[model samples]
Target chain A: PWGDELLNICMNAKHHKRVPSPEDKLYEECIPWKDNACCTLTTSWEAHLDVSPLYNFSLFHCGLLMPGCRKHFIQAICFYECSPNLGPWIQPVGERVVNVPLCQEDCEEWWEDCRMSYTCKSNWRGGWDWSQGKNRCPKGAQCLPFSHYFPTPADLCEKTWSNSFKASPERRNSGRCLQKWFEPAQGNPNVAVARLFASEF
Target chain B: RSPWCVICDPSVVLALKSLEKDYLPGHLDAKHHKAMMERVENAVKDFQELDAYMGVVDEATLQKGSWSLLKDLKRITDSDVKGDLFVKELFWMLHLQKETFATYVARFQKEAYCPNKCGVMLQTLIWCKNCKKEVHACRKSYDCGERNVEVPQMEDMILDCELNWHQASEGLTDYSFYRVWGNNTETLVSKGKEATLTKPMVGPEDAGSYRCELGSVNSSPATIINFHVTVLP
Candidate 1:
């Protein structure tokens, strides 16, 4: 029941303009979590949370993660979209897996923009470019930045020196990645899209 | 070029700022927050310097290498970007900042468990190579019918990717899975108590290594487990 209420609050905020603003105190108990050192929201409370809503709640509560232990940074978006919330009601499992960061809105254009619209930022292969409501790249190929000198996808994969935002050398070498160039519709786009490649091309 | 295209982006500064928002509210006795605060300040300085270096486009610097910029960044941050590739440095350095913050949250959770104290009970399971199934590895040396099976080429499979940990500790209470990237850093594989393969396309590219970590507040150490797999060709 508590999780359901949390879910409604988070989902309403995520889908609609219902995300309560700070002074509204809608998330009073939860709001302190933004900068306050994060505490584990234990499963001990029998909070029947599914992955999808849990994720949405996590980011909806704390968009920013702390330093260095960032490997789980991206999933708060993916899992919140589809993972099931089925339950035997496992203990020690619920949201609050990462800290909610409160970024300053006035610092820099990119910081504020990216912070608010992270899901819009494209991943290597393709995903919704929230700003444009378009896919990161067209349907056919993996994304390749234009920086590396590798002439084609194959070369980009083989070139030990080349790097991808998401791919490993082994991934590129396996022919799962292809080097291609495209204009990024999101972010500044003032910088050229250097040689970018996405494995699973 | 967008400032983020290189490591000089300011979003990282904002993220680091978030990390230092404050210490756990009466959760732990140690002032680890003080240590992280120093790191955050130093990172801020490095970011400022990186912006300064990028403000100019020198011929010698352009034709040669950005060794000086790399050194300055390295001295302050623990970013995962490769020093040799100046181009990808900024992109990954920004990402590395995200990783660093995530790690910090994990450490906090690990150290901030509940009444029973924080501890992590973890298990890593995979789908059967032949059957494309789940719950193959439980104990001892993994046995997959004596045949090496692979995670299917293009199907998204959810394995037993859950963990158990103590009270009010979100960071340590769950598990974080990752597919180790080229630079030996990692990408977020899965989170929130299960390993759901978010990236569905797995051919030869998925055949590599991965790991899961759980920060335990009960113990001072983070529990780590590694897995290596081969994707079906």
Candidate 2:
């Protein structure tokens, strides 16, 4: 019994469709959104690839990403691409979402996994050297361990994509925060959160 | 008796107008208003002078110059009476401008290359033979139109999808470019806001109607700039 104002919507971004739809064959980490997704089966498959047109970003720019670290990155991509529950945080820019509340555990785990991995910059939103047909370290930038750039979990979540993800104090399955990875069997907890936020507006 | 007052600067005027819109109170006391205005004006004057001086310097020196300028402003603001907030606002604005300028300088020094992501946020720098310097240009989406152009054979030419400075600053950036000839469409390697097709040593074979398609990576191109080229022997 959803209100007309609480219509399920997708971000006005390139990969997203104008409306959310079912993607039964959504791949890998994006499988959670298969019941209802902004991304198609193809989009989901591409997300896990080494280079997806979704952002054309490289997880292995510094070095081969450890499996632990790479999993979170893939999940992050899945969340950004497929989740239709991000309507509330979607900015007017359409291309970007402002401060989508990320669970503290999610942020911490992401940082913990990737801290030892290397990157050239603190912020991944821009200022990258893309002349080589993909994101690369800018000229004169040194590739160091991620911890050197992102000292804390909050820094990694907030600065990585220019505040697209806000590190929240809320915990997973609390029905208060957005979880990057969720158990589809438990049902979608973010549906309630998005509904609550949509009602406020 | 200053040659250039910050109050008269267009950028400062716009900043002050924005400040007025966002934070300035409707019934502020005259003394407080005057003090705040004076502090901002003075800070902007110093910032302008430092910016001009640093513009011609190396990146490292420019970074240090801006850092010192910010430090000086912070010190001055710390000692101010009740005008700290206004000056702090000015401080951040100056700092952001410094970064923007630094980015421009860094881009100019590098070889011309297209960014993978294109849009308003990212500026594309390309070497301009006409200007004899690096210039900023972005491809813009416009309704499909055919334009005829005549080029001399065995000459280098750049077919630019140009967006003027003001239009580019306000528009969105995220579309890639595709070049279409006859029925064949191929995505351009340079995938930034500025989509350029450089044809060197043009011959009869190169003479054809080339359609430049601007659109997002996922979707079909929405806008096209059709160029009908004729090579003169």
Candidate 3:
């Protein structure tokens, strides 16, 4: 039998169900093919397609645009949320991934490379630059970690972010600039992995 | 006079705090603490690397030319979802369910489609001419929802994979018997051994996609097995 506290938690909420169902507020983003047959679907040269004419060979979709800071934050938040146990709902981390290449690049600095010497298990562990390798973010990919409506920490605010993150402004009067949440607020301890390499500034 | 030390950045406070939390005398939990905490601590450490990439503090965002994110960084600082366990849950749901819902609605809505053995979308069952096999060589795929797999039943579909491939075939090939039962009914086939079509069934959005399926008639009829059918294109 389950604990009374757990049962009570469910009972109290279920008791309140008479309060009517909320409207299904949907999130809508577009897909190219269905909406417009002529407009070319934009896929990262990263997401490949299998076509004939070319016969047995396949080609790369080509270059990629860097993921914005918000995307990075979202990415970190995703990893953090899943780090917890949720019964059979969540697959083992290993089984959760399908396109291993995209998954690898999703959390790695070297998103464009074709190399595969890294162990399958060693690929993109926790969003860090390889502890053993170098920062691989290409030129033009790094951008300021925030936007105008939002300013990064004063001491260090710049557009370049990578494995070797240096805070934007150097702290005045003998100091390095800093930009971290005052509270380690996100519930999962693993969620904080997005801020590695902040001292380089 | 001592050279001004550059190590005192205020933005780095989070990073520093993280390191301290992670390295505490015995504060870290090994099974799920030290190593994991260290990963998060580093995110704080690398907070402003974008500033350097853009060069000028005023030129960070490239979407609209030279507008640096630095100017808007105030938003990021205060925008922290902080410590709320649910923020991550909501975010995960965006990736896990919202995205899936979007994909599902796009593919299913008014134009639902799945393949059973009877449709015409499958051009030819690629069998080793030497063996004259049918189902033995066919890679059967079942689309219960947007995710397709070779499961014998629909109960197995999850967000795990959008497609599944079965490498073995039964050597039977028949369009009539296979098509009628599999595509349009839930009660027609055997409880656990039914399958999806190879070609998508036709419907409003199906335009050209199919939902045809094919399976072997019986295991003992070894030489030539028959596949049942259903159409949804």
Candidate 4:
């Protein structure tokens, strides 16, 4: 399994095992709790107490962090190594998500009388200086793509890579970065794929 | 870009090469080539998606582990388990197991307190009254390995839950009981459809956890409860 493979890659051959295991090895990085910790632990503010309340509702609570990048690469390699008939070759495109606002806000703020509406004319700004206020219209929460990451992908790094000796560097690059491996290395496709897969495994 | 720019991605290359080696030997045609190319395009799309998916989960586990568990658990109804029974029984069962494990782990860390200190923790029947009525209710959690209940001096001790559901003894049929001792683990107290403390005892020696198991002697237990009892002086 890629879990074992990813786990092994984090370790050296001199420290190799008779039977591979994913213990004590860094497979994924910590996508730390930001903004709100309780919301993170419960996966959202909806039911605050449903998940394991290990933090007693405080100390660094979190939902699942993204699996490590090495783990991602390992799993993709497993798919590449798979037979066409092993499973459904095509993953259906994910569901569309709409960022429905918790509530609506005014597009234009006409002060003095404090008139706020979904839409208002620029001339209706009364004596309220438009320069003092943001002329930009009210924007709803970002339309988020359905993703595996909790809260949202915009909430955390899309990818991460780390050397054994240091914390993982935050990487925002998507899986498109992996395509580099398949590109012909020194103009040899055979050698490229072989060198990439062999060492990766 | 050339008209053949479609042949750029390595997956497309691999698919084309495989088509030549595997499919072309039997037959080849214009329409067939067109259809095959479309399939190749879809296959490439899927490859990229699957690679992207691997950033979080592998194909099989992502579907089985997260996709359904997160979505369905969110949608599960109280009556989903048994007839008119409380919140999804499986979820409640799992919650009990988590609480029990957390409690046991805490106890294990403190001082091997429970009689089954080293023994495998088992899921016992636990009832959440609110869950029986509404899906939104939160069940009380007792993950502190053992509950601390002070048995009053001279009162006939009834150790069952304040409500039958809370004790999780609603559906259990057969039962075997035990009490934790200082050495050699525990000795079986009795066996039947339910636990009976015919006579209540007094003192700290009787203070600790008691257990009732409802299941068979064969393939693993169905439910187990460890009721920690403390006798007041």
Which candidate number would show the highest TM-score if scored against the true structure? 2
- Worst 10 contiguous positions by lDDT, candidate 2 chain B: B126-135
**Residue A22, candidate 2: alpha-carbon lDDT:** 88
lDDT for each residue of candidate 3 in A91-125, tens digit (9 for 90 to 100): 23422311111122233322121121111111122
DockQ of 4: 0.01
Clashes of 1: 40
Best by DockQ: 1
Instruction: Give the runs in model 4 whose Cα sits over 4 Å from its true position.
Output: A1-201, B1-155, B162-177, B187-207, B211-233
TM-score of 2: 0.45
| TM-score for chain B considered on its own, for each of the candidates | 0.30, 0.33, 0.17, 0.32
TM-score ranking from best candidate downward: 2, 4, 1, 3
Overall lDDT per candidate, in order of appearance: 0.29, 0.61, 0.23, 0.29
> How many pairs of residues in model 3 come into backbone collision?
102
Q: Per-residue lDDT of A1-201 in model 2, one digit per residue for the tens? A: 444354478888888877988874676578888889988877776776665667788765653444457678878889988898887787776466889999999999999988656677888888988887888777888667788999999999898777989999998877678988887778777888888677743
- Per-residue lDDT of B156-196 in model 4, one digit per residue for the tens? 56654222332422233456677877674988877765544
TM-score of 3: 0.16
lDDT of 3 by residue, B126-217 (tens): 11111111121111212222222332322222112111222222234432112133255422222123343232333322121122233334
Superposed by TM-score, candidate 2 places the C-alpha of residue A143 at a distance from the truth, in angstroms, of 1.6
DockQ each: 0.02, 0.01, 0.01, 0.01
